[PDB]
Amino acid sequence: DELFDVKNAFYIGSYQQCINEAQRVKLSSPEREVERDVFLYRAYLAQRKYGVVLDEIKPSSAPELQAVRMFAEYLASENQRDSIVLELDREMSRSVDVTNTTFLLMAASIYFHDQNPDAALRTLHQGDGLECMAMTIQILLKLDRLDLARKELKKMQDQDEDATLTQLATAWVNLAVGGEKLQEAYYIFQELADKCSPTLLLLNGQAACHSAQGRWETAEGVLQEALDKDSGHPETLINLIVLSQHLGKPPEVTNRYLSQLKDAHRAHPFIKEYQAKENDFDRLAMQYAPSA
């Protein structure tokens, strides 16, 4: 696979690396060229550079790109989403085409955000690709059906044990499993970071593994390193808040990270949940509180 580096960089989480390499790579095939562009834009989406994707991908572009763009608009425009899903539903039902894997993944992604796990899973079921399998496992884990997840993992495991995508998948299942497994997950994350490069994604994964186990202090270094690279990184800040409390840092510290998160991303679901909790708490207070 010529694209191997580009894709691999993408999965690990080093988007810029993916973008840089994608450009360097030569097409050598109308097919490959399309795949390259798909990843290139996918990388931009990870970066959250929606405008880049929306502007550059134009109607004349290949259908694979179109799917990517579809996802991009979904992420970019909140208003557009219901309309997009409706169309997605229509396209999904009124059209058989399984072959376009990219379409399935993008479509599944939209459903995933839509929180229609069934639809996303339904779509993924059709897709053959290894990535489809990985995405499938991830959805199952969110579903909290580890058992189903395990089956898919082995499914991919038989196909390609060594693939990084498979390894990441195993780590995920692993993290979910708990127990001795956690160490296994830790090593895979560590190995990837060592081989490829510490990515924010990889660092947090390692931290999560350590945190799952008692080792709060060990976690400090990875988070600290991650924070240094990108302040405002959502996973990092959240982990820091959790880590800070275990460490016994001053309560202000936990608060500071939390506030920092709001600055970086007002929208972030973690923030929304936090707000939601505040609301019901007030609601509950009234319930218990004495009347006057």
Partner: protein, 313 residues
């Protein structure tokens, strides 16, 4: 399937566990039954703070929603079924904070001290305690907090009341005397005794003053204070006598009404805060505890449930 947070809720009675889970309503209920906590409002910061720490996050795939991890204190043994949230707050932490409270009391920062004390007191129910004795310490820790809170709060008021009437003065001395009873550490206990002695001296209730002086000396205050105390004591001896009768019985056991700051002798009916142990006169029952601020005075409760040891089968 079943979410890990839910598993935690099913698994543990402890309120902190539920808060970590995010099950506020459940947690509040537990606090309501186990302890009196009617008024949750002072709790809000604790809940959100506790809640924030509950789960970690990592990203499975790019451009997808991030995953959440739920750490378990019994990670090794806990299967999918028997997980329980990691700790995060411990008894030692609370105990350590206590020193700061002591420091503030000495400085005279009483109002701030009350806040720190109350903060700790409220936090006690949050703890997960490993062993039986450790449970006792927690209870003891709570007791210390209320003792200071009621005592300090009484003191703040006493200063506020007017000096002018003789009756007003008798009131002040009485309150000062009540403080004497509070079970504080010797550094503080000495300080209060020192104050009471002066008030009683001016009151010309020398006989009572002498007793305070003797108690103070036993504590072993600094030498300057001790010398001063001896001086006052000798003066009192010249005319051992109390000019006025006060509503204070050094010998008879007391219980200070947290609200009224009036003595409740031995057997006399009292209503107590389920959580703090603060005492109130029967009138108060059903009202929000001044000390705790969260609890209901009258409420009957299961009792604090910090550790799983408490549950038996």
């Amino acid at each position: 399937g079943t979410s890990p947070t839910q598993i935690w809720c099913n698994n543990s009675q402890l309120p902190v566990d539920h808060i970590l889970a995010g099950s506020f309503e459940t947690a509040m209920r537990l606090l309501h039954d186990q302890v009196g906590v009617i008024q949750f409002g002072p709790y809000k910061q604790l809940f959100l703070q506790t809640y924030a720490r509950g789960r970690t996050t990592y990203q499975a795939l790019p451009c997808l929603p991030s995953m959440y991890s739920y750490p378990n204190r019994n990670w090794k043994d806990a299967g999918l079924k028997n997980g329980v949230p990691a700790v995060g707050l411990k008894l030692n932490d609370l105990i350590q904070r206590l020193q700061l409270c002591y420091q503030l009391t000495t400085v005279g920062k009483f109002e701030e001290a009350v806040e720190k004390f109350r903060s700790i007191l409220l936090s006690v129910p949050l703890l997960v305690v490993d062993n039986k004795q450790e449970i006792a310490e927690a209870q003891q820790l709570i007791t210390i907090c209320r003792e200071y809170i009621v005592g300090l709060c009484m003191e703040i008021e006493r200063k506020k009341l007017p000096k002018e009437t003789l009756d007003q003065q008798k009131r002040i001395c009485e309150m000062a005397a009540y403080f004497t009873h509070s079970n504080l550490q010797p550094v503080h206990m000495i300080l209060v005794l020192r104050t009471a002695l002066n008030l009683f001296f001016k009151l010309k209730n020398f006989k009572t003053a002498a007793t305070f002086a003797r108690r103070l000396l036993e504590l072993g205050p600094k030498p300057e204070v001790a010398q001063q105390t001896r001086k006052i004591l000798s003066a009192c001896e010249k005319n051992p006598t109390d000019a006025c009768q006060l509503n204070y019985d050094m010998h008879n056991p007391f219980d200070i009404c947290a609200a009224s700051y009036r003595p409740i002798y031995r057997g006399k009916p009292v209503e107590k805060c389920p959580l703090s142990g603060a005492c109130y006169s029967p009138e108060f029952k059903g009202q929000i505890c001044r000390v705790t601020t969260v609890t209901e005075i009258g409420k009957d409760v299961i009792g604090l449930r910090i550790s799983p040891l408490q549950f038996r089968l």
